[model samples]
Target: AGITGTWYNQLGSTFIVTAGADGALTGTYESAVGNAESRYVLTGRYDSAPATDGSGTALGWTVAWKNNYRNAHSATTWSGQYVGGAEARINTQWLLTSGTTEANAXKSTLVGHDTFTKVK
Candidate 1:
């Protein structure tokens, strides 16, 4: 519709950014699942055109995002595929990590997943 905005969690305790300007996206997660508060920035470009590029499937999108948490907790970053249109959708194939050497370090970290659709 009109760009992007913020999204909240189930408990309304955390605030995460979903889509960004020009196809860029960002998000902030809380630590209720574990015991730490962290933040991550996701940036990528979306391919939304009228006709399909190669395959004869509905035009979908792809995005690449990196996660950065506190305490040097990083994991192997991965790219997420997204679908845009009247009802856009995003899908993460991996366990979204911070590219750090710590395993399950971001278990309890989450800002929220409640989409914040602006009315402006």
Candidate 2:
């Protein structure tokens, strides 16, 4: 797959891949996580297209979170690979950061991983 489709992770977070050109893509992400109860912009790119063999193709994406009215501005970035096998999946480790304006924003950072599977 060329990283163009809708997928959801274990957290039930939704990722819609709307545009893919060359090696980059643009889309949206709706978190089933914290306060981001709305859709956020998502942008990503792949180093190489998935090979004919079942192997991992490096890819990553980021979202500028909608923090509502909170002083903590935050974003989440996922870096992983697109595994081609029985089903196409984007498996990634995510890093979220809140900073600059929130009180103790530095300490508010978080890390996690997600395995996103494409919807049928």
RMSD of each: 8.4, 3.7
For model 2, how does the per-residue alpha-carbon lDDT over 59-117 read when each residue is reduced to its tens digit? 88888776453333778889998876567788899898876656676687799988988
At residue 58, candidate 1 shows an lDDT of: 22
TM-score of each: 0.36, 0.77
Candidate 1: tens digits of C-alpha lDDT, residues 6-104: 423234423234453344444544424333444444343443332354321121122233234345443322234434455443333323344433665
lDDT of each: 0.35, 0.75
Candidate 1 local lDDT, residue 20: 39
Give candidate 2's error at residue 54 in angstroms: 3.4
Estimate candidate 1's alpha-carbon lDDT, on a 0 to 1 scale.
0.35
